[PDB]
Amino acid sequence: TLQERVAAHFAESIRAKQEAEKILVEPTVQAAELMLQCLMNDGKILACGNGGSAADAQHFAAEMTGELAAVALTTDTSALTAIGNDYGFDHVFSKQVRALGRAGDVLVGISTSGNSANVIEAVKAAHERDMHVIALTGRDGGKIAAMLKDTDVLLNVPHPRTARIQENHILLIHAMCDCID
Amino acid sequence: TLQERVAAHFAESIRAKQEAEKILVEPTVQAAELMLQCLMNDGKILACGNGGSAADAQHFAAEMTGMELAAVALTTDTSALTAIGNDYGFDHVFSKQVRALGRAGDVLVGISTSGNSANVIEAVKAAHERDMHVIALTGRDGGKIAAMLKDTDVLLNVPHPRTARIQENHILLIHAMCDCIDSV
Amino acid sequence: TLQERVAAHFAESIRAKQEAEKILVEPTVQAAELMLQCLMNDGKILACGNGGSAADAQHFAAEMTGMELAAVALTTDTSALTAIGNDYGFDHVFSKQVRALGRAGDVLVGISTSGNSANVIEAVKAAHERDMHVIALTGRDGGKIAAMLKDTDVLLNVPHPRTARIQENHILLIHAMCDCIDSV
Amino acid sequence: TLQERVAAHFAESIRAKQEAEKILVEPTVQAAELMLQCLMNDGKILACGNGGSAADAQHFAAEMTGELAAVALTTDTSALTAIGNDYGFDHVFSKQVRALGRAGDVLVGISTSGNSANVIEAVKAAHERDMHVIALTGRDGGKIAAMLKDTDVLLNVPHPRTARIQENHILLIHAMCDCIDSVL
Ligand SMILES: [Zn+2]
Ligand SMILES: [Zn+2]
Ligand SMILES: [Zn+2]
Ligand SMILES: [Zn+2]
């Protein structure tokens, strides 16, 4: 039944947040403290991800500029298609990190599995630039969680389902924004 | 402290979802049914909204087009938004695209956390003018958008004051509707 | 010298347009006629391309939607572009949206300065499988795209080696097509 | 006749470039030199405009990034739609200049008439932030042309029609990028 299906979506979304609340409070505060340190020293925040996580990158960037220095790397479609066509899709965010990023800025990489190849490249590029990284991941954190440093902050939602991971990410993003102001 | 602030966001968001669960289950089915009827008659679904709701509109569209379903977000063509904003005024940026793309039987999904967004209101008017049905994703009391709706439209009002919690519930409603559609 | 370099750009751009003037008047008319036929039979035009051509696609669509005409650029929804690129692969970013939105009688305008863009090629296939007609905006010799067209499609090839000159002729061509549609 | 109209479009575009070729060489060179000075001192370049000029701002930025610091302010549709709705459409570019701009950076403002209100606000915010400005205008340069300082650079295409001004802007953009590339 569609009524039971919908109700099962609500129940699962409540179970995932209850599960997430007990582990994600301290990391989220560390993420917002990292962004405040970046912003208070004339830095800026770059954000990226794919699909619904690309939507979440521009949502976050719009909260900040609506003013605080934040740019989503998922919005310039000439850039995404030029790079996608000539260099390959794995490089669409990294090349923008290399273009805009400077020492002391923060990268917010978003990937529900933690294995998004283009987010992986962007994190690598951020490290070469001496930028800090905040990874919004799900499941076990994937390759992205393994490649982080002690100076980075991991926000892993432990739930296997992508829809549930996205929902927690937008909540994490609203908590960080409210912490910052 | 910052710890207590984050903790409270989580708890507020759990509560918002527990209260939403009690009133939004049957309307979410109506909306999903309304989209199935449209897509099975070779119709398409147009989505629009502002800020976070603009992010929601394109999130929705991408999960439809990613078999491939007919959905277009009206919040993505930046040559269209800025041209219509600059020349005709920002209140007409969605309504004009409804007049370009909309056809009888299509569905407009309009997203407004307050229910009062001038450009989504104009888009609702336009969608009615072209014999389209409307799924309004609103918050608070539903605003002007809820007052405009016909009996053939479906209202999904998130009963909550804070924008952030309304956006969070809107994305849950979208995931629920998409999964009902996939299920058929 | 920067003065001579800039001068050379203008002169080269003038030369490029004088040559296209000799051989692109009749095809441009055929392309516009095809779009008028499609629009008058309640159809729509989909546009796609990479880089500067992505900009051209959304420029074209924005001048159609600003009465309002049915035209969607497939290069604007970043959730769709990034979802399909990540999940399936970059070569299906346009072809999947064509399968979502396209119907019989619609028109795909594929823009590609070499005629060899992998994602624009895959889009042409999907348009053919949907019984849509194609208008290719290409450069150089027309690449694989020019080779791929049916009798009922229209090739607008800019016979020039340099990408920058090809883009500049493409936007002229678009403007001339939009004005021909306006006149009817 | 459609053939005659298209022919007239090619002829008018060649005439407009011949007219533009004889005044814009020196200014274009000064614009490229300004950009090089910005970049070489670790600055970045911001671009904005409406309609086709938003396409051009996006085009420009993409040729810099694929690497040089350039951002179009026309691309984040969540930001454009929030600011349009909450604060008003005149502030969509200026608010982003306030967010991102730093002393010594360059704003590229693109406007076919010189009278785009949101570009005017962008120019104003840029001067308060000690940024230099390259204005791509047409006709007489409008309010934007009167507003510029000695340290800025006007690139005015003297032609009445919007299509012809746009075509020339994309040429100017290609000339500037090639000047910047030749120096590095
Ligand atoms: Zn999703
Ligand atoms: Zn929000
Ligand atoms: Zn170009
Ligand atoms: Zn134009």
Residue numbers in the entry:
A (entry chain C): 3 to 68, 76 to 190
B (entry chain B), C (entry chain A): 3 to 68, 75 to 192
D (entry chain D): 3 to 68, 76 to 193
Text taken from the publication that reported this structure:
GmhA is conserved in many Gram‐negative and some Gram‐positive bacteria and is responsible for catalyzing isomerization of the D‐sedoheptulose 7‐phosphate into D‐glycero‐α,β‐D‐manno‐heptose‐7‐phosphate, which is the first and common step for parallel biosynthetic pathways leading to generation of GDP‐D‐glycero‐α‐D‐manno‐heptose (D,D‐heptose) and ADP‐L‐glycero‐β‐D‐manno‐heptose [L,D‐heptose; reviewed in Ref: (Valvano et al., 2002)]. We demonstrated that GmhA homologs in Neisseria gonorrhoeae and N. meningitidis (hereafter called GmhAGC and GmhANM, respectively) were interchangeable proteins essential for lipooligosaccharide (LOS) synthesis, and their depletion had adverse effects on neisserial viability.
Residues 69–74 (chains A and B) and 69–75 (chains C and D) are disordered in the structure. These residues form a loop in the vicinity of the active site and could become ordered upon substrate binding. The zinc ions are coordinated by the side chains of residues H61, E65, and H183 of one monomer, and the side chain of Q175 of the neighboring monomer. Zinc ions were not added to any of the protein purification steps or crystallization buffers, yet similar to Burkholderia pseudomallei GmhA, GmhAGC held zinc ions in the active site, providing further support that GmhA is a metalloenzyme. Zinc binding likely drives the “closed” conformation of GmhAGC, which was also observed in structures of B. pseudomallei, P. aeruginosa, and V. cholerae GmhA, thus providing further support that the “closed” conformation is catalytically relevant.
